[PDB]
C-alpha cells in the first residue's frame, strides 16, 4: 500500500490559505523521495527533524496541508512568527516537528486578467490558536456601531483577494505551500519508508 503523496503535491487548485484542507495520512509506506524529486523548491525548511533522515523514522500520524500564498509570506510559515498569514490564517505551534516545503508555481495560477479565486483573511478579533481553521464570512466590526450584516462604513469583509497575475515580482507571484506535520506518541508506528 503506497502513500498518497503525488495526489497532495500534483493536485490542481490548491485551497486558499484561509480554508486550508488537512489530508491526514495513515496506513502507508511513505517514501519521502517523490517529494524531493518534484520541482526546485523555493524553501525546504524542516523544523524538529533532519530532512535527510525522514526516510527512516516511523511516526504515528502525518498531516499535509495545501496553501496558495504570496512569495514574501512563505517566511511566516514557521514556529514563533507573526504577520498577516501566521496570525489570522495559519498558526504553526511553537514545538512544530515537520517541513515547510514551498514551490514557486506561477504558470498555473495568476491568470492574465487576474486570479481572484485565492482569498486570505486579514481581519480577526484575536490571533489564531495553533492549528485552527476559521472559515467565517461574518462582517468584521472594525468600528463601534454594530454592523448587523451590511458592509457599511467601519464594517469590512475579512477575506481579501490576492489578485495574482503573471506580471508581479518574484516576491508576489503565487506560491504553493505544503507543510507536513508528524506526530509520534504511544500508538504503534504506522508510517515510514522501506528502511526502518
Amino acid at each position: 500500500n503506497l502513500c498518497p503523496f503525488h495526489e497532495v503535491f500534483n493536485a490542481t487548485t490548491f485551497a486558499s490559505v484561509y480554508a486550508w484542507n488537512r489530508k491526514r495520512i495513515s496506513n502507508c509506506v511513505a517514501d519521502y523521495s517523490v517529494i524531493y524529486n518534484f520541482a526546485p523548491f523555493f524553501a525546504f525548511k524542516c523544523y524538529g527533524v533532519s530532512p535527510t533522515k525522514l526516510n527512516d523514522l516511523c511516526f504515528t500520524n502525518v498531516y499535509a496541508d495545501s496553501f496558495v500564498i504570496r512569495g514574501n509570506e512563505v517566511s511566516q510559515i514557521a514556529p514563533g512568527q507573526t504577520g498577516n498569514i501566521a496570525d489570522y490564517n495559519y498558526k504553526l505551534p511553537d514545538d512544530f516537528t515537520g517541513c515547510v516545503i514551498a514551490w514557486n508555481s506561477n504558470k498555473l495560477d495568476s491568470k492574465p486578467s487576474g486570479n481572484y479565486n485565492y482569498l486570505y483573511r486579514l481581519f480577526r478579533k484575536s490571533k489564531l490558536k495553533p492549528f485552527e481553521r476559521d472559515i467565517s464570512t461574518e462582517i468584521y466590526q472594525a468600528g463601534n456601531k454594530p454592523c448587523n450584516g451590511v458592509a457599511g462604513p467601519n464594517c469590512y469583509s475579512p477575506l481579501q483577494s490576492y489578485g495574482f497575475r503573471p506580471t508581479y515580482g518574484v516576491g508576489h507571484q503565487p506560491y504553493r505551500v505544503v507543510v507536513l506535520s508528524f506526530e509520534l506518541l504511544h500508538a504503534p508506528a504506522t508510517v515510514c519508508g522501506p528502511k526502518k
Partner: antibody
C-alpha cells in the same frame, strides 16, 4: 468623521525619552491596523511602527529596539514610547488607520518632534 | 525594499491645463500603488488607491493608470487648489509601504 489628535511633541535632548499620545475618535484602536508614520521636513513620509488588531507589532529597521508601540482600548488611545532618541529622528509624526487596500486611509494632524543640543 | 522615485520634481502648470505626473519603481510589485496629495501644513490625503481606482470624495479629474513599474497620475484640469505635493506610495507589502519624494505642482 474619523479624527486623530497627536500629543507629546516637543524638544528633547539626544538620548532622551518621549511619549507620544494619540486620541482617536470614530472607531476602536484595538480592532484596526494602526501605523505611526514619520515625515522628515524635507522628504516624503516614512513608516516607523505598526500594530495589528491582534497584538503583533512591527518596527522599521532604523528604529527597531528603541520605540515601543502600545494601545489602550479603555480610553481608545495609541501610545508610542521614544527611547535613545537621536538628532536624526527630528520630524513630524502622524497616526494612521492605514487600511489602504480598502481605500480608507485617515491620517492625524501630527506633532513636531525636535531633537537637538 | 522597493524604492520609489517620481519625476519631474518641480512640475509647473497653469490653472485649467492638464498635468501628467509619473512614478517609477525599482522592482515589480503586486499592483498596489496609491497616489497621495499633501497640502502644506496638512497630513497626506488618499487620492488614488490600487493605481487605477479613486477613493471617496475624490473629484473625477484625478485618474491613475499604468502597471508594472511605471505609474502615471493624470489631472484633467487643475483649478486653483490642486497645487500641492503628490506622492506615490507602494503598499505591496501592506501594512508596510514606502513613499515617493515629492512632485510639488507650482502655479
Amino acid at each position: 468623521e474619523v479624527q486623530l489628535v497627536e500629543s507629546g511633541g516637543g524638544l528633547v535632548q539626544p538620548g532622551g525619552s518621549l511619549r507620544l499620545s494619540c486620541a482617536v475618535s470614530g472607531f476602536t484602536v484595538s480592532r484596526n491596523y494602526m501605523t505611526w508614520a514619520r515625515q522628515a521636513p524635507g522628504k516624503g513620509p516614512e513608516w516607523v511602527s505598526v500594530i495589528y488588531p491582534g497584538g503583533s507589532t512591527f518596527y522599521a529597521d532604523s528604529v527597531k529596539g528603541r520605540f515601543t508601540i502600545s494601545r489602550d482600548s479603555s480610553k481608545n488611545i495609541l501610545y508610542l514610547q521614544m527611547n535613545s532618541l537621536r538628532v536624526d529622528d527630528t520630524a513630524v509624526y502622524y497616526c494612521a488607520r492605514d487600511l489602504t487596500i480598502r481605500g480608507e486611509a485617515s491620517w492625524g494632524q501630527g506633532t513636531l518632534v525636535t531633537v537637538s543640543s | 525594499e522597493i524604492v520609489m522615485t517620481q519625476s519631474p520634481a518641480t512640475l509647473a502648470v497653469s490653472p485649467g491645463e492638464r498635468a501628467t505626473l509619473s512614478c517609477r519603481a525599482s522592482e515589480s510589485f503586486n499592483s498596489n500603488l496609491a497616489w497621495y496629495q499633501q497640502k502644506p501644513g496638512q497630513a497626506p490625503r488618499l487620492l488614488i488607491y490600487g493605481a487605477s481606482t479613486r477613493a471617496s470624495d475624490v473629484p473625477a479629474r484625478f485618474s491613475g493608470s499604468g502597471s508594472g513599474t511605471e505609474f502615471t497620475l493624470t489631472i484633467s484640469s487643475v483649478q486653483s487648489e490642486d497645487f500641492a505635493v503628490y506622492y506615490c506610495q507602494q503598499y505591496g507589502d501592506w501594512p508596510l509601504w514606502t513613499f515617493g519624494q515629492g512632485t510639488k505642482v507650482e502655479i
